[PDB]
């Protein structure tokens, strides 16, 4: 009955919000990441890091507001409040982009905390820890995109800024500079996310339309009982229906629900791998066969070459405002443009 | 060709800044999330029916009448993971929720393409922020616009003879 | 000396075969363009 | 097209080795029951 156990006792009490040992890491870090984002989006500028306005205070709306990344000149500085850049000055710290690192790092440690929470509760309750395992997928994405990617580049500046439209810009950057749509690891992620949404919708609909009649009312929700032993819908009729509409169907409820975990988890993991390649500018940018033929044959044209022209438009038209530290000056006459436009 | 189509759409309609597309992403991301959640909750609460040396899947026999997992255990774990009243204990509600979220999200995104077809485009905040003198103060919307512009001026580079690409 | 008691039979059912062949073939279909480059 | 010659062998093995492995385990599974 030492103090350690007394604390364990208290941390693991059944209450409206379970705390647990993982609570000690989760709750401060989750609350700080989230408070930093609301604080910066309400009050803090990106004028000195990006030449952008980015808070409600400056005139931005929910779509355009963001906690932006530090200036390229910070490199990968941890940008600690007490560090050599801001030197304890809260105000300067904000102005130099210190809230980005605050949010990214407290967020990483909250994610760990949350995954430890899934592990802690699963152990206390007596269930298998497959929900913690599935949550590895979000983690991979977050670390690869917000940490590994800009660590392979010149600075945090080129990580995603925390904002709706800042993220849209990140999407478009990756098309023009990395040709990310062409990347087979992104395509595998696409198929996992879309395949996940499909599975989600097809499994819910199927259950709802093979229900057993277990009550008299037109509202069928009332006729389930959390503790009934009986399946509430017919796997058998569900299986014949899909075998006859689609050719194949699930027959194993256990396989089905594992497949539902497997598909979206795997796809997110594949896309994380691809982003690690782009950390290094290791892109699937080109097909060498196409380029050789196109250079020699001015009549040969594909959707592959058309999209590279668009990427070239993107880079030159957005680079100078998007990378202000580079002092890109592109006089009118060097901008790629088609006819009239 | 799919990618071509979606790049040119963005240039001409600013689909990313359109709410119906944002609801599509929410329907698709949320769908993948709830797919993973539901599959991991059922999978976590399967009732021991097998040994270590065999697929747990053999613990369910096609057409058995008893359920193959403990939903009260799944509820009890997920309710504590968040809080009790944000977890489903009614399997009918839960499975209807699975169905409606990505169906509705994707209706909206289909509606997005269908209404942008009539050139009612995404929000335009280009130069919405200016200073006391009237200098433009850029935002992320303006950066997005520099990208859209590069797409605009390069797409179908021999097919425009006049300054506005009106269709 | 005894024969080793830890030996176990291995199984792959027909559905798992179909699933796995589809995976490989579709993986091959996706990456072949990049192998040829 | 001027295409990577080894792409062919790479594709064939990529298909063949994993596929052959599955068939081996399937057929010896059927021969048990």
């Amino acid at each position: 009955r030492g103090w350690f156990d007394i604390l364990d006792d208290w941390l693991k009490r059944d209450r409206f919000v379970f705390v647990g040992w993982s609570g000690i890491l989760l709750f401060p870090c989750a609350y700080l990441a989230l408070g930093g984002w609301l604080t910066g989006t309400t009050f803090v500028t990106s004028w000195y890091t990006h030449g952008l306005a980015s808070s409600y205070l400056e005139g931005c709306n929910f779509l355009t507001v963001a906690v932006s990344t530090p200036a390229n000149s910070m490199g990968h500085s941890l940008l600690l409040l007490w560090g050599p850049e801001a030197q304890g000055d809260f105000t300067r710290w904000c102005q130099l982009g210190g809230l980005w690192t605050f949010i990214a790092l407290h967020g990483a440690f909250g994610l760990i905390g949350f995954m430890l929470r899934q592990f802690e509760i699963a152990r206390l309750v007596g269930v298998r820890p497959y929900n913690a395992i599935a949550f590895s997928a979000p983690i991979a994405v977050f670390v690869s995109v917000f940490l590994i990617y800009p660590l392979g580049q010149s600075s945090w500046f080129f990580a995603p800024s925390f904002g709706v439209a800042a993220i849209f810009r990140f999407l478009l950057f990756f098309q023009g500079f990395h040709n990310w749509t062409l990347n087979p690891f992104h395509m595998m992620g696409v198929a996992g996310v879309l395949g996940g949404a499909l599975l989600c919708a097809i499994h819910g609909a199927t259950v709802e339309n093979t229900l057993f009649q277990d009550g008299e009312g037109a509202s069928t929700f009332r006729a389930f009982n959390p503790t009934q032993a009986e399946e509430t819908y017919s796997m058998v009729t569900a299986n014949r229906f899909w075998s006859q509409i689609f050719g194949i169907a699930f027959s194993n409820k256990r396989w089905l629900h594992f497949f539902m975990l497997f598909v979206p988890v795997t796809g997110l993991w594949m896309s994380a791998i691809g982003v690690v390649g782009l950390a290094l500018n290791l892109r699937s940018y080109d097909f060498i066969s196409q380029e050789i033929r196109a250079a020699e044959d001015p009549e040969f044209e594909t959707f592959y070459t058309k999209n590279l022209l668009l990427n070239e438009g993107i880079r030159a038209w957005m680079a100078p405002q998007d990378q202000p530290h580079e002092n890109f000056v592109f006089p009118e006459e060097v901008l790629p443009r088609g006819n009239a436009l | 060709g799919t990618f071509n189509f979606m790049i040119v759409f963005q240039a001409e309609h600013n689909i990313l800044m359109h709410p119906f597309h944002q609801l599509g992403v929410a329907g698709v991301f949320g769908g993948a999330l709830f797919c993973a959640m539901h599959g991991s909750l059922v999978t976590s609460s399967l009732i021991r029916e097998t040994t270590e040396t065999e697929s747990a899947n053999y613990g369910y026999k096609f057409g058995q009448e008893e359920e193959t997992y403990n939903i009260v255990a799944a509820h009890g774990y997920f309710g504590r993971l968040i809080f009790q009243y944000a977890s489903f204990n009614n399997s009918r509600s839960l499975h209807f929720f699975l169905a409606a979220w990505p169906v509705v999200g994707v209706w909206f995104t289909a509606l997005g393409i269908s209404t942008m077809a009539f050139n009612l485009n995404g929000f335009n905040f280009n130069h919405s922020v200016i200073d006391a003198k009237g200098n433009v103060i850029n935002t992320w919307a303006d950066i997005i616009n520099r990208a859209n512009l590069g797409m605009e001026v390069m797409h179908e580079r021999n097919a425009h003879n006049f300054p506005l690409d009106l269709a | 000396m005894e024969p080793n008691p830890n030996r176990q039979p291995v199984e792959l059912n027909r559905t798992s075969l179909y699933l796995g062949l589809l995976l490989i073939l579709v993986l091959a279909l996706l990456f072949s363009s990049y192998f040829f480059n | 097209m001027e295409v990577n010659q080894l792409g062919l062998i790479a594709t064939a093995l990529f298909v063949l080795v994993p596929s052959v492995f599955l068939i081996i385990l399937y057929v010896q599974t059927e021969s048990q029951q």
Binding site: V236, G247 | - | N13, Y18, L22, L25, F36 | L8
Partner: peptide
């Protein structure tokens, strides 16, 4: 040779479809 490879793989998938549907493990009740 690339054309033949692409089409060969696509043809194997279609064959696989055929067997997965008409030559499936037939699901049996309980």
């Amino acid at each position: 040779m690339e054309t033949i490879t692409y089409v060969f793989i696509f043809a194997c998938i279609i064959a696989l479809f055929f067997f997965a549907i008409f030559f499936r493990e037939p699901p049996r009740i309980t």
